[PDB]
Amino acid sequence: GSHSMRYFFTSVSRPGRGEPRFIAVGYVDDTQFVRFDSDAASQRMEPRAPWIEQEGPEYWDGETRKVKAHSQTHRVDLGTLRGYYNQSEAGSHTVQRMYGCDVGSDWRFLRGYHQYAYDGKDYIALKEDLRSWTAADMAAQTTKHKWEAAHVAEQLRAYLEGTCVEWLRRYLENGKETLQRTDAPKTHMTHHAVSDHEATLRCWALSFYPAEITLTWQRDGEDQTQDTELVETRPAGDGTFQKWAAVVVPSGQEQRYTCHVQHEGLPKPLTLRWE
């Protein structure tokens, strides 16, 4: 189907304590494959998926080198941003960066993005066309001008339309056995009697990949989407995902309620009947 490759960077300054923390991870779709921790012993880019082991020692040296240059630029950015916003050198702050690309079902480029945030608010981002910038407030307007004068946009277009897609296509092949699979949600349904006139109906979806899924409750064919308790999709820890959605019904009425599961591993949507 569609596929994506994304890199996430997290920089937390730790005043009085030493270097700021720097953590970076990379994902294909919903699978993480590399990590770097500025606190680990190794000080290396490390594998997190079995198929990224196929890459040679030239890969691991090159990525380790690139991640360190990324760390260094954030290390400088924490100071710069502190001055831009006129903040004391005592408070701790967070800088986050995300960037990557998407491809469609033909594995052709769909979109790229590069987003930058400071203390969890949008700071600066590359626009959809990959040629313009969105500046949040005054501090970003300076970084905007500075990055327009340096043609930083054009460096990114090169990566997001080219290098990114070249690599995502390379990883999707090396991980074909797992990245190009779909694990269909195993489903089931529980009935828990709460009151004397009420009961809790819960709809379960287990062991499914990718994480995208839809769980809805229906009554007489109608989405009951104000009376449902739907939990945020959660990792099961083995690569697959979990989700459940529950509703609280007047007893005697269970056969009016039906559960609806839409997943890309399901050829036809499911409908789990109470009967």
Binding site: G62, K66, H70, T73, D77, L156, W167
Partner: peptide, 9 residues
């Protein structure tokens, strides 16, 4: 694969 360098803010 990562960018070769990121530009300072």
């Amino acid at each position: 694969s990562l960018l070769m360098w990121i530009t300072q803010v």
